[PDB]
Amino acid sequence: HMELLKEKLVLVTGAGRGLGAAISSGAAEQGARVILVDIDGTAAKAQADALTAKGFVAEGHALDVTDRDAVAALADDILSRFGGLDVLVNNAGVAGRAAFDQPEAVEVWDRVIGVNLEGAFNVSHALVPALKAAKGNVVHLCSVAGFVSGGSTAGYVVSKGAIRSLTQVMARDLAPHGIRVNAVAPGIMMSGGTDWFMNRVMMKRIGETSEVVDPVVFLASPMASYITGTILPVDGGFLAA
Amino acid sequence: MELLKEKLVLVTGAGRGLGAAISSGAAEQGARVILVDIDGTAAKAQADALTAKGFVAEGHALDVTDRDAVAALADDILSRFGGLDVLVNNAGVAGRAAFDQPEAVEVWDRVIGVNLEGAFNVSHALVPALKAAKGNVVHLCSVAGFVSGGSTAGYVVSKGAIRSLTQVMARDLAPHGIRVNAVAPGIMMSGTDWFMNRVMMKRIGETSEVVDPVVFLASPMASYITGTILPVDGGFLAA
Amino acid sequence: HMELLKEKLVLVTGAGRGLGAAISSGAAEQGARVILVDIDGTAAKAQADALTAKGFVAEGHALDVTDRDAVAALADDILSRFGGLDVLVNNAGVAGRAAFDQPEAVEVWDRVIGVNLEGAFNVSHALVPALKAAKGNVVHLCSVAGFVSGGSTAGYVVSKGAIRSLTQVMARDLAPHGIRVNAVAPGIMMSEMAVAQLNRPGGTDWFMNRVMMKRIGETSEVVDPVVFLASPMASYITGTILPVDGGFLAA
Amino acid sequence: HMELLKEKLVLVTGAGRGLGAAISSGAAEQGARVILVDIDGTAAKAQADALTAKGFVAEGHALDVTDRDAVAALADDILSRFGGLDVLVNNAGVAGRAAFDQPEAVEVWDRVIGVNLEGAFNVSHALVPALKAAKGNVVHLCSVAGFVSGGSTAGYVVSKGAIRSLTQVMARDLAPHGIRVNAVAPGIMMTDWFMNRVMMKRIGETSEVVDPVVFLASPMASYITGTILPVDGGFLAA
Structure with missing residues (x-):
């Protein structure tokens, strides 16, 4: 009954499982009408x-965020059917395993960069007309890996530092149109491979999925109406350690 | 929204401006508020x-530079209420002086004394009460804790110090279930060209637009956020 | 006369013009043998x-840093002829003009990401065996635009923030092999102003209105920090991005 | 014999031992005339x-950087005898051991803040006239603790984050006078919180902090101001 997103139209990518599904449900619980792709x-x-x-x-x-024609078709449909878009959450993403000095790093780099960075660009750029019409806002999924290397593969780290920068420059260019652009930077959440994170997180626990959803909803809401260009760590203290 | 329902919140610098607005905002979210x-x-x-x-x-009344008076208030809160759910360190001052001017010394001592030393005094003294309630702390940082901007040296340094205080308090108080965070506002409704030329939203933030992020950080919505400094700056630091 | 790079083999990309040419000259003056591409x-x-x-x-x-086959061929040639590489400077880079809400932003994004980020990855990844053999180091060309949006187009800002992250994760994965990885983050320097017809009026104001030194940097003032990071003076520095920006990012 | 500081007058605080003594020696080896306090x-x-x-x-x-009268006397002496100061290295500093929830943290806080931050302010502010006359530059000793909490006591972490900010605002106010202001941010100098995260899996040698200090103090860094340079084996990038 909080209603932070009352009657707002919210598009979530990667919404079929995991954090994306949880963001979709959380937005709906805050009053939003949700398009899940x-x-x-x-x-x-x-x-x-x-x-x-x-x-x-x-x-x-279904949406393949790497297919620019399909992304454009969805943007056209949203603008036609709804007149605008109040919130875009770029959650579609992948990770991978490869050290930089391994040949496998190239295939992993291409796959991860392709979804995490190029897909977020595709969807963000295509939805600008709809976001302009509604004076909506964008929340990207960054990561603690956008600030430090942590334990993730090079393509993942680079894609998330790229998203950090994308947040800043989208915020600059879309501010004159009344569009805020922000990101959350989670650590590991519920949705020794994890020791790099667990050995540094101050709360000594993995975040609940709901604990990443709540900051996303905050940034998408009028509580954050003077916040743009900003990346909010949701990391149990990892980056402060 | 009931984000702070029946929580006890202490706000310093609460007689005017942002501090009074944070106090009112916490009460509107269901909190019991101590304003000093x-x-x-x-x-x-x-x-x-x-x-x-x-x-x-x-x-x-509370002079945050008076360690005896701060200790007396912390003792009073622990004895009367058994704990403290939220501490907001908002008391702060500024001044005008360039670093190469003799006046910079008096301004430095005054601003450091309230903004940094006072925040340390209150934060350290309230640890027993925050432990008892598993409460949390929100400091008032500033965009000046990230870049020099246009503020006097003592103010810039005090806010960079607060940024670091947020991290190390979070580290030392995490084993006790205490989160520690900060907001970093730009210039507030409660010359300024250095800010206005860079702020993407091309406007000064409303006081309520800083209150809402403080309430967010003090609430269970931020239960996996600690050691974090959140800019509330209309895009200034991203420019 | 300092000989900070005495007898080291240095590869500089984008070395035919501007800052890349100046880095190549500065490395040679510090005693290096230089491969310019x-x-x-x-x-x-x-x-x-x-x-x-x-x-x-x-x-x-000639080297097209976007051509993975060409990059591999150069890496193989360096390893075969020299047995390793002491310094890689990823300087090749381009910019562009387009706001995010314009259709032109897509073509600019693709071109700028392709050279600045994907090209730096191609060259860095291909040269790892040569850098391991020499225990060499890498200096990337970042920018103040890797820290704030400034006045640059989205593809440039994002490519440089990506380079900032690439510096960190390459440093992480190559440190066990004795390879340091760092970057410089320049503001504007004089080589970027050398073609008058391409200096749009007011095009530097985003930088000049904030830089503390109130001047464009001399090209040599960006070359010197590159040489420093590539040298044993920086032997305990890795994963680091050094602003060379007249105070811009501190303002 | 690189001569990076040839004929420059360099003042180093905390120069009687450790890193400060090594910076003084390294500056002399680069051609400087050195005042060690x-x-x-x-x-x-x-x-x-x-x-x-x-x-x-x-x-x-001798110099107690917390004694403003003594700092002023040294500044006046440098101006009288030399007329300017080409480099100031603020290296005087202390650490301590106390967790934030302990009563001991107050005394440790006061001692560490007093030397590391307030002493750096005292010496920097007092030497502005001499730095102006020479168009000199300042190198502060920051720390990785100015960026993350690491393992140091609260007063140390806060003192170094304060130094990071002092670097920026001194650079801003002194740039019109041709004075650059920068800092180095070392890790642990010649511990698991550091060693388990440093990419080079070693503590830096003292000479490896001296060389970046000399670089920042030299014309190689003539377009660098307001900057804090990590010298940390990759710790902050991990």
């Missing part, structure tokens, strides 16, 4: 149907 | 206006 | 031939 | 006399 359209539609059954307003579709 | 200020008359006037609206509030 | 092989060879005429040891080649 | 004047003079015995030009004095 995912490379797996069946999963996006299943999440949307579950939200509809709970009494929320939601729809799901 | 160097001007105890103003703190009690703010507290009485909250009481008239049906909130639970009280006001006191 | 540029998308324009004729320009790289003209710069290398001028260094040879001056009395230095240098060679020039 | 330390809370222990005997140690400052011992370091200075050793440099004199090598044919360098050096002198040593």
Whole structure:
């Protein structure tokens, strides 16, 4: 009953599972009408149907964020059917495993850069007309890896430092149109591979998925109306250690 | 929204400006508020206006540079309430002086004394109460804790110090379940060209737009956030 | 006369013009043997031939840093002929003009990301065996735009923030091999002003309105910090991005 | 023999031992005339006399950087005898051990803030006239603790974050006078919180902090101001 996103239209990418599904549900619980898209359209539609059954307003579709024609088609549809977009959450992303001095780093780099950076660019750029019409806002999914190397593969680290910068320059160019642009920077969340994080996090625990959803909703809401260009760590103290 | 329902919140510098607005905002989110200020008359006037609206509030004089007076307030809070759910360190001052001027020394001592040394005094003294409640701390940092901007040296340094204080308090108090964070505002409604030329939103923030992020950080919405300094600056630091 | 890079083999990309040419000359003056490469092989060879005429040891080649096959061929040639590489300077870079809400931003993004980020990755990754053999080091060309948006187009800002992160993670993965990885982050320097018709009126105001020194940097003032980071003076510095910006980022 | 500081007058605080003594020696080896000051004047003079015995030009004095009268006296002496100061290195500093929730943290805080931050302010502010006359530059000793909490006591972490900010605002106010202001941010100098995160898996040698200080103090850094340079084996990038 908090209603931070009351009657706002919210598009979440990568919404078929994990954090994206949880952001979609959290936005709906804050009053939003939610468009869920995912490379797996069946999963996006299943999440949307579950939200509809709970009494929320939601729809799901397949979207490959690396396909510029498909991204443009979705943007055109949103503008036509709704007149604008109040919130874009760029959550679609992947990770991988490879050290920089390994040949496998190249394939991993291309895959991860392609979804995490180039896909976020595609969706963000295509949705500018709809965001302008509604004076909406954008929340990107950054990472603690956008600030330090941590333990992730090079393509992931670089994609998230790239998102940090994308947040700043989108904020600059879209401020004259009343569009805020921010990002969250989680550590590891519920949705010795993790020792690099667990050995440094002050709270000595992995964050609950809801604990990343809440800051996303905050940044997308009028509580954050003087916040733009900003990346908010949600990391149990990792970057302060 | 009930974000702070029945939580006890202490705000320093609460007799005027942002501090009074944070106090009112916490009360509107369901908190019981202790307002303290160097001007105890103003703190009690703010507290009485909250009481008239049906909130639970009280006001006191507090000089944050007086360690004895700070300790007496911390002892009072622990004895009367058993703990403290939120500390907001908002008391602060500024001044005008370039570094190469003799006046920079007096300004430096005054600003460091309130903004940094006073924040240390209050933070350190309230640790027992914060431990008992597993409370949290929100400091008032500034864009000046990240770049020099246009503020006097003592102010810039005091806010960079607060940025570091946020991190190390978070480290030492995490084992006790205490989160420690800060907001970093730009120039506030409560010359300024250095800020206005760079702020992306091309406007000064409303006081309520700094209150809301403080309430967010003090609330369970921020339960996995600690050691963090959140700019509330209209895009200034991203420019 | 300092000999900070005495007898080291240095590879500079984008070395046919501007800052890249100046880094190549500065490295040679510090005692290095320099391989200059540029998308324009004729320009790289003209710069290398001028260094040879001056009395230095240098060679020039064409290299498209976006062509992974060409990059691999150069890396194989360096390893075979020299057995390793002491310094890699990833200087090749481009910019552009387009606001994010314009359709033109896409073509500019693709071009700038392609050279600045993907090219730096191509060259860095391909040269790892040569850098391991020599225990060499890498200096990337970042920018103040890797820290704030400034006045640059989105593809440039993002490419330079990406380079900042690339510096960190390369440093992490190559430190066990004795390879340091750092970057400089310049503001504007004089080489970027050398073509008058491309200096749009007011185009430097984003920088000049903030820089504490109230001047564009001399090209040599960016060359010197590159040489420092590439030298044993910086033997405990890795993963670091050094602003060379007249105070811009501190303002 | 790179001569990066040839004929420059360099003042180093905390110069009686450790890094400060090494910066003084390294500055002399780069051509500088060096004034060494330390809370222990005997140690400052011992370091200075050793440099004199090598044919360098050096002198040593006691200085308590927390004593504003004594700092002013040294500034007046430098202006009178030399007319300017080419480099100031603020290296005097202390640390301590106390967790924030302990009562001992207050005394440790006061001691560490007093030397590291307030002493750096005292010396920097008092030497502005001499730095102006020479268009000199300042190098502060920051720390990785000015960027993250690491393992140091609260007063140390806060003192170094304060120095990071002091670097920026001194650079701003002194740039119109041709004075650059920078800092180095070392890690642990010649511990698991540091060692487990440093990429080079070693503590830096003292000479490896001296060289970046000399770089920042030199014309190689003539377009560098307001900057804090980590000298930390990759710790802050990890």
